[PDB]
Design a binder for this molecule. Structure first.
Ligand code: HEM
Ligand code: NA
Ligand code: NA
Length: 167
């Protein structure tokens, strides 16, 4: 089992969601704490997790939060502490999620699977792990998005790279 030395990830959540949040209906915004933003993707930086290079499994852990607001404060969604977990060419995108419903009532989703990952590329070696995966919204994620997306909705893809060490 190898430790994660430095990891980075890029994920836009969903391009059409970014456009909706900033557009004339939601009339909203996002703020970021420990997360960047560039080329329509949120930017994550972490130094924890572990990878099994022989079995091609692992977890890559990131700190930081994205906070979406809109609809006069009725929309209020936080996604924090994302984790990319993988076992072979499939995995899970896990995060701490809190989101308000269309009545303005906040619901805490715990540390939940936000989406299922299917890797189109995944390389794991002694010194590096990297890959790209489609992200399919989970049932809990659908509820957090106020049912505007069905479970199984394809979100933006997620990519990551990590240097590994410390066996
Ligand atoms: C008074 C409250 C709200 C009203 C009136 C409202 C209205 C709308 C309308 C008219 C649309 C576009 C039509 C559609 O895609 O079905 C939309 C899209 C959407 N709304 Fe809001 N909404 C509200 C609150 C919320 C909340 C609390 C969330 C939770 C995250 C949310 C998430 C979404 C999503 C995910 C979409 C789809 C955006 C896309 O990717 O195209 N909405 N909403
Ligand atoms: Na580490
Ligand atoms: Na894992």
């Amino acid at each position: 089992s190898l430790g994660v030395t430095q990891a980075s990830a890029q994920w836009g959540v969903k391009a059409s969601f970014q456009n909706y949040i900033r557009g004339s209906i939601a009339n909203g915004s996002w703020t970021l704490n420990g997360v960047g933003f560039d080329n329509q993707q949120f930017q994550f930086s972490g130094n924890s997790g572990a990878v099994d290079a022989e079995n091609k499994t692992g977890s890559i852990n990131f700190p930081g939060s994205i906070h979406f607001t809109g609809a006069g404060g009725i929309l209020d969604m936080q996604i924090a502490n994302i984790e990319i977990s993988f076992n072979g060419n499939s995995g899970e995108l896990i995060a701490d999620v809190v989101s308000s419903d269309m009545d303005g009532n906040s619901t805490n989703y715990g540390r939940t699977v936000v989406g299922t990952l299917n890797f189109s590329a995944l390389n794991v070696s002694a010194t590096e792990a990297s890959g790209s995966a489609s992200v399919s919204l989970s049932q809990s994620g659908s509820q957090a998005f106020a049912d505007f997306y069905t479970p199984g909705t394809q979100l933006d893809p997620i990519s990551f790279s990590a240097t590994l060490g410390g066996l």
